[PDB]
Symmetry: C2
Subunit: 608 residues, 2 copies
């Protein structure tokens, strides 16, 4: 019949139909025609009656196929079996707790088909954090495998894989024994077999939801199992990745992230029993599997960690974790205002311990050094605590997050400046300033994005530290704008962080702007009541439909009178027109406007 | 009889727990209660089982009377200290230092130094006017001073103390010992402002000396009338605001003379002017502009030296300890930053801070976490500077140095072993920020000074705490142990465990113990063994004494000094 573009494989196990409502809805709302994709659910031997109800459900959907296998224990064998019965050109591994954005299938397929891609690595979104794949999802790239294996990071399985490519190269998930980071093996095997990879960065494709339920299995908490799994992963890299630059990247990335990653604040969150266990494991892994040259790919602080790890100097690493504890960079709002159709920010930041006192580096002779106790300084190669060659590698960038979609984006076009300032004696602090503007239409991709609160954040990097935190301000900030049929309010939110409310999802634009009460005009021939807004930045033409409620003054149990109202922006002024029209009214009346589902508390009263 | 404890009857042993532990002779004080109540009194030789408080006042036979409340406690040496202070100075009222659960101060200005003749300072001496003072019974009956009857009026203790002073009360302040701990466990808007009118009318009708009237008017107009023109406006609905604002307007016009505004700071003169105008819209906006102004002190350096703990702190006026608080220079005056829509409505000098830039204060304080008593750290040095940051914007920055001698605050035996919390108090431009001293980096420093273990540290909240006596933390743990430096003598049965980093000063001998478990075997019964913490000649060490059991091999040695075990992984061969 008609060729299938996309096969969505979803493993299940004791999965109630109610737990699939959001998933099924996100698939049903795909712009792609439903006879061009298929769903392949494979049940991992459920013991309850959830499989029966799944098969009954699938009887009403011709593009949905449902199968059950003997219980294997995890979703690898369900994914593999679903893959062998899929018919689509591309396969998406969609976990049943996750959802897909409405234009994903169309955009991903068109991108993969036009560029003959074997893997489409689409922008993935996560519930928490201010970024995901910040480096890799930076621009669309149809030839991303030219960058080497890093084009597949983050190595989740939530990409679109060309089915014939998986089958031709026998790329499958491991279903013989549970392994950690199974998706890292899967994506590595794809790259090793010469996959053409494309990165689709301009549209969120996949939403990996954080459920809050814990994988509280003894398998994932066993420290001996953990380091057995890390040994297996590094031996997999060394045995199978032949291109030197790809092997060295994987060895560096994973040594830094999961091996040296236990040598910082992890040392302050664990007891000596588990520290000694995991530390001895890491020392053995560095010696046996990690070439000594890898350490030259690392930043200064990681070179110190690698050095002391190989020395077995756990006591110094513990002391260094105490000295490093709390280093951060939080941005303060210096200025915020609307100009034309955009919102402008001036921000400032400096490196601190937990937004308190200054973080310092020390100038000795002609080199800027890390402030360390003399016992540790004399134990290290001198270059490792010399920041001199790193004082020009600071970055300071802004970012935004949709509070409903959870999509995160870099705000482009910013200018920033980071200075190393001599505070006192030979101590130097790190100060930064940034200017940027927000054109909210750059981030409105789905219709739901038009009414959303947006949260603003800054990303500061330098000296090996990365601080991506929300933008904040201390004083109360409330500023409003009416820009080309968009209500916009920038404000200090309830957590003390900077937000932009578009579409009255959180705040009332009438209440936040104020009402020139003495400038209210009543036209008794047309029934129009004009209510001009006080403090608001108006750009372009705007007409927001709403309504208003009238109740007579004095009557306690008065019945409301509902009429149509309009928020109008023209000639850089804003007003609410309440259309009484033909209604017969007399006396004084309360007036409460209801624009975009928010009511004002301006105590407006009119007399007819 | 020396002291009579009046108690408003309400539903007993809880109330008597703090009373029975008084150092004064129990037959020198009595307790006045006004079927189980008979059973309780007949077994006590000193018990005698607003209107009930007046009856108990007449019938008491003690020289002084304390009006104790439920849940409120009294420190174990209060009775004998207050009586000797009053009788020797022939005092009619003893305004002893009062302790409250939360906050970093209470009676900061009044409880700063003892004053046996404090009545000469004016009516200000009785602040705070809580009913928790000691009143001479012969003076109360002489001037017929009683609690107001016939109505549940608010600020009853304000009337009571004002009646005492206006009758020439001989009052003295006892600030060197905490006397009364107040636990404290009319919301209708028309009732509130009816009661506020009563209090102000009581001032103008009964206070005869002008110096005391102007103070009481000022202190109460500032705190309870203008007190609703700040952050209060941001925490109430428009209906409630409109009601109380019109009451406050009426009370200012009808009862508060104009010359009271001259005694107010700039920001309070602004609120007074706009209140009398009825400009509620501007007071609302001003409340948004003022919100969050504070001054938090960071720690710049902290270290022990000799027998004291030294601190170096810094602060800056901020909004919520984020961006800087600014003031603006226009011509030759430092103006408060305001919108021109409000600047023009105001008398131009009410937002000019020029004459106030020499009045910044910056002082440190301490507080006991268990006793909840607060003290000012005597002998501090501080400096405040108005610095131009950019363009004509000026910020307010300060620095301070001080030291802590923990013996200055040890009064009860329970103070020897309790945590302490350090704080700073920064006033200026009408604002007052008394907040905990904070630090961002991990700070852990130890000391063994004259049989006192001391640990200054950043606690889980990021605030500076001082643990004296291993009440929360282990001295051995935070000091460190050099396992590569242990000394073991099997003949004498003595294991010498030195301490890594610690400030030792004087001679110290803390009696402790330890525990031994064989290295390898995991379910052997624990062997408890006595030990000692020794501090001598600028060095500390723990000496364990073993020679009652036989042992050979590797053992786990866990110290237990003052009930705090270490986690230093000590193994002995
Ligand atoms: O914020 P940023 O955008 O800067 O960076 C955040 C991530 O992009 C960064 O961590 C990437 O390098 C992560 O990609 P990787 O391939 O290393 O790791 C692969 C794993 O995340 C993947 O196997 C997950 O399934 C692991 O699950 P969890 O263990 O539950 O997390
Ligand atoms: O922080 P500080 O220690 O500076 O201030 C602590 C107090 O001295 C300060 O609040 C004073 O203004 C209090 O003195 P008063 O106005 O008599 O207040 C009387 C009330 O305490 C008393 O009547 C209570 O029953 C009212 O709740
Ligand atoms: Mg079907
Ligand atoms: Mg700060
Ligand atoms: Mg109480």
């Amino acid at each position: 019949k008609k060729d299938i573009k996309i096969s969505v494989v979803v493993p299940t196990y004791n999965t109630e139909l109610e737990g699939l409502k959001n998933l099924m809805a996100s698939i049903d709302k795909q712009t792609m025609n439903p006879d061009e994709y298929e769903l392949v659910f494979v049940d991992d031997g459920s013991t309850t009656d959830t499989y029966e109800r799944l098969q009954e459900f699938a009887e009403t959907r011709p593009n949905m196929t449902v199968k059950q296998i003997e219980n294997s224990g995890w979703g690898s064998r369900p994914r593999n079996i679903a893959t062998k019965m899929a018919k689509g050109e591309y396969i998406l591994y969609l976990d049943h707790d996750d959802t897909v954005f409405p234009e994903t299938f169309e955009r991903v397929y068109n991108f993969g088909k036009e560029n003959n891609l074997d893997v489409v690595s689409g922008k993935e979104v996560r519930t928490n954090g201010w970024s995901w794949g910040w480096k890799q999802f930076s621009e669309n790239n149809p030839h991303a495998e030219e960058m080497g294996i890093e084009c597949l990071l983050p190595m989740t399985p939530h990409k679109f894989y060309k089915r014939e490519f998986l089958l031709e190269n026998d790329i499958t998930f491991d279903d013989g024994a549970r392994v950690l980071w199974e998706d890292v093996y899967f994506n590595s095997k794809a790259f090793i077999h010469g996959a053409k990879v494309g990165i689709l960065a301009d549209y969120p494709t996949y939403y990996w939801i954080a459920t809050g339920a814990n994988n509280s299995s003894s398998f994932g908490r066993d420290p001996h199992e953990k380091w057995n799994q890390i040994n297996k992963l590094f031996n997999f890299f060394k045995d199978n990745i032949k291109e030197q630059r790809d092997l060295d990247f994987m060895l560096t990335h994973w040594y830094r992230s999961r091996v040296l990653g236990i040598l910082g604040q992890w040392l302050l969150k664990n007891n000596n029993e588990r520290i000694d266990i995991e530390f001895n494991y890491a020392k053995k892994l560095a010696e046996e599997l990690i070439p000594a040259y890898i350490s030259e790919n690392l930043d200064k602080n990681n070179q110190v960690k690698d050095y002391l790890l190989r020395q077995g100097d756990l006591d110094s690493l513990k002391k260094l974790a105490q000295i490093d504890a709390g280093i951060t960079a939080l941005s303060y709002v210096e200025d915020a205002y609307f100009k034309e159709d955009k919102l402008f920010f001036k921000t400032s930041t400096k490196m601190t311990y937990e937004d308190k006192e200054d973080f310092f580096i020390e100038k000795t002779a002609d080199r800027m050094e890390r402030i360390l106790p003399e016992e540790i300084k004399s134990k290290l190669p001198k270059e490792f605590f010399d920041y001199s060659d790193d004082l020009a590698e600071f970055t300071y960038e802004p970012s935004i997050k949709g509070r409903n979609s959870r999509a995160t984006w870099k705000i482009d076009g910013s200018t920033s400046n980071v200075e190393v300032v001599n505070k006192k004696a030979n101590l130097y602090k790190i100060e930064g300033e940034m200017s940027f503007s927000v054109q909210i239409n750059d981030y409105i991709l789905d219709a739901a994005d038009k009414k959303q609160p947006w949260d603003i954040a800054t990303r500061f990097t330098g000296l090996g530290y990365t601080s991506h935190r929300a933008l904040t301000i201390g004083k109360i900030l409330i500023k409003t704008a009416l820009i080309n049929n968009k209500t916009m309010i920038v404000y200090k939110n309830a957590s003390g962080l900077i937000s932009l409310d578009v579409g009255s999802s959180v705040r009332s634009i009438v209440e936040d702007s104020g009402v020139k009460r003495e400038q209210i005009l009543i036209d008794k021939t047309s029934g129009k009541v004009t209510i001009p807004l006080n403090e608001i930045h108006v750009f372009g033409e705007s007409l927001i439909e709403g309504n208003a409620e009238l109740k007579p003054v004095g009557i306690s149990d008065a019945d409301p009178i509902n009429v149509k109202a309009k928020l109008i922006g023209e000639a850089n002024k804003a007003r609410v027109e309440v259309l009484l029209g033909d209604e017969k009214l007399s006396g004084e009346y309360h007036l409460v406007t209801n624009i975009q589902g928010k009511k004002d508390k301006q105590q407006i009263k009119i007399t007819l």
